[PDB]
Amino acid sequence: GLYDGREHSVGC
Amino acid sequence: GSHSMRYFFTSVSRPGRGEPRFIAVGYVDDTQFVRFDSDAASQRMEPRAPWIEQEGPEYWDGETRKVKAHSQTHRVDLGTLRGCYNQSEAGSHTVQRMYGCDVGSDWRFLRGYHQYAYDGKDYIALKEDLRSWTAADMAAQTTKHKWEAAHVAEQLRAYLEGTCVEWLRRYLENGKETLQRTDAPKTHMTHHAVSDHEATLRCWALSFYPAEITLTWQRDGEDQTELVETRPAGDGTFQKWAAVVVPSGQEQRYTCHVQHEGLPKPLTLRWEP
Amino acid sequence: IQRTPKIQVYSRHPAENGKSNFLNCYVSGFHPSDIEVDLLKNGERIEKVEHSDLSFSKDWSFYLLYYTEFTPTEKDEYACRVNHVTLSQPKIVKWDRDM
């Protein structure tokens, strides 16, 4: 089972 | 014995030839059980194990949705990272990710990890206490502030302490005849002839599972020798060998010691010609 | 940044002339991911090779596995040609039965 919920990106 | 379940994601960029490639595999401790590929024609989270095909259709629908949600974030990570490094628009740069969770012999949470890389260099990671990050430059530090002002770790701890272990226990219960087995290695020792007054003993260990073994030579009691990586046999087993160069005439004084989880008592190997 | 692969060519079961078997070519430890691997018989290519998926180790270095089905014979020679970015020329590894 994968990870569900509010995937965040990288800021730079 | 302990058990684990990990996930590996990859996103290689391609400029001018379309969209970045995206491969995502999933492992129980040493057995791949699912995969995905952005170039195959299925566009679905395809099974790769016998004990996993017996799940319903909603499971596969959810898995496909989530693995497609991950790639849409990798594709933007690539662009942002290329932009904030003053790099060209013609090379191919790689982003990798990995996470999972461990359980003990009593099948309760033991450890959890979540990492992130860029061009093969560590970028950011979740510490052993699952509450603080580990930066590596000014870039990682700014990302750490952004992720720490959105409690990202709090959201990513519930999963690894709850649902990861729940899924791992469900999988371990279903595929019991495959995941909970230990195969004892089959060992033999050979002989070469490099010159007139030398030799090269070798200690083989074939077709064992899991992939954690140790081979050591001992010149009558003292440790020392070229080893090779544990290589996959292709059908869910593994192989390994270790060799020690030795002057000729002294061959009944060397021993090879084999230690595997599937072996109750340590095995000793001596030259019996 | 860039690492160079490590090649091993072996057979699944212990080789024996006349019995069906498999030929593996396990490359590991390279970076980046774009690699070209071929299994050769008598110097010519083989058309029906399959490979596993792109995984990586704890230090972010990839590894693959190419395999095909063959029948060993005392007259034929098998090999594995690999070509990476960090290699200035291809690398031909032969299959000696004891490794």
Residue numbers in the entry:
A (entry chain C): 1 to 12
B (entry chain A): 1 to 224, 228 to 276
C (entry chain B): 1 to 99
Publication text:
TCRs are expressed as heterodimers of α/β or γ/δ chains in complex with three CD3 dimers (CD3εδ, CD3εγ, CD3ζζ) that are responsible for initiating downstream signaling.
The MAGEA4 (230–239) and MAGEA8 (232–241) peptides only differ by two conservative substitutions: a valine to leucine replacement at position 2 (V2L), which is buried, and a threonine to serine replacement at the moderately surface-exposed residue at position 9 (T9S). To further investigate the structural differences between these two peptide epitopes, we conducted cryoEM analysis of MAGEA4 and MAGEA8 pMHCs in the absence of TCR. As expected from their conserved sequences, the structures of MAGEA4 and MAGEA8 peptides were highly similar. The most notable difference occurs at peptide residue D4. The distinct D4 conformations can be attributed to the V/L substitution at position 2; the bulkier leucine side chain in MAGEA8 results in a slight remodeling of the peptide backbone that in turn favors the formation of the peptide D4/HLA R65 salt bridge. For PN45545, Y50 from CDR2β appears to make a cation-π interaction with R65, while in PN45428, E52 from CDR2β forms an electrostatic interaction with R65. These interactions may be compromised in the context of HLA-A2/MAGEA8, where the positive charge of R65 is neutralized by its interaction with peptide D4. Our structural analysis of MAGEA4 and MAGEA8 pMHCs showed how a conservative valine to leucine substitution at anchor residue position 2 can allosterically impact the conformation of solvent-exposed peptide residues contacted by TCR, thus affecting recognition.
